[PDB]
């Protein structure tokens, strides 16, 4: 299958994703593909993984929250080669994963 699906399956341990409890924030239109603000939010998650489904190497980042984290929010700036779907995956203590997804328009393609 696709690279996104292979990374997803490694992250779920072979299980389908679920839904709810995760917010993916990205701009509807990102002016500059080289630097696109992204925020992910998932109360209780042990880890949140970020994938950009239209990039050659779709993996962006995996955020692991330690015990000193006040909450399970992370924000970053990413590269998007062109208009595409951004995917967030949040893994809970029990090992189950939820998926959030949103399409980002990119005016100036990155790179």
């Amino acid at each position: 299958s696709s690279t996104v699906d292979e990374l997803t399956a490694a992250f779920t341990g072979g299980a389908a994703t679920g839904e709810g409890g995760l917010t993916l924030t990205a701009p509807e239109i990102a002016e500059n593909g080289n630097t696109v603000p992204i925020e992910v939010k998932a109360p209780g998650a042990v880890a949140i993984m970020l994938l950009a489904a239209g990039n050659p190497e779709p993996a962006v980042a995996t955020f692991n929250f330690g015990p000193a984290a006040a909450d399970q929010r992370a924000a970053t700036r990413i590269r998007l080669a062109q208009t595409q779907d951004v995917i967030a995956l949040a893994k809970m203590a029990d090992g189950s994963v939820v998926k959030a997804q949103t399409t980002v328009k990119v005016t100036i393609g990155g790179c």
Binding site: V36, A59, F63, N64, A68, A70, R77, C111
Partner: protein, 107 residues
């Protein structure tokens, strides 16, 4: 790498138990491996591949970073500040460099 200059914005004090937002950047080209030259040759990847933030010896966040993360990697996240001490920020380069920063916090 040369000139890997950390930039952290965080409050220097908190109330006991208060959440504080932490913003950490470092200067880095983040050569992604996707860029081509004028000869049309791919330019080899060289990025910072991991960022950690600890508060008083306890992890706040541990980030595994891939080439899609932008030039001058920026991470923002929230710390639960129980007692006075310090944040320690670490960045790992693909080239074997380790960059560190330290920020005090009073409670």
């Amino acid at each position: 790498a040369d000139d890997a200059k950390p930039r952290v914005k965080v409050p220097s004090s908190a109330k006991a138990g208060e959440t504080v937002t932490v913003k950490a950047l470092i200067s880095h080209k983040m050569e992604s491996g996707q860029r081509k030259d004028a000869d049309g040759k791919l330019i080899p990847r060289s990025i910072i591949n991991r960022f950690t933030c600890e508060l008083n010896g306890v992890n706040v966040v541990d980030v595994a970073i891939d080439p899609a993360v932008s030039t001058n990697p920026y991470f923002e996240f929230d710390a639960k500040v129980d007692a006075a001490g310090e944040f320690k920020f670490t960045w790992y380069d693909d080239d074997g460099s380790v960059y560190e920063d330290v920020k005090p916090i009073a409670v």
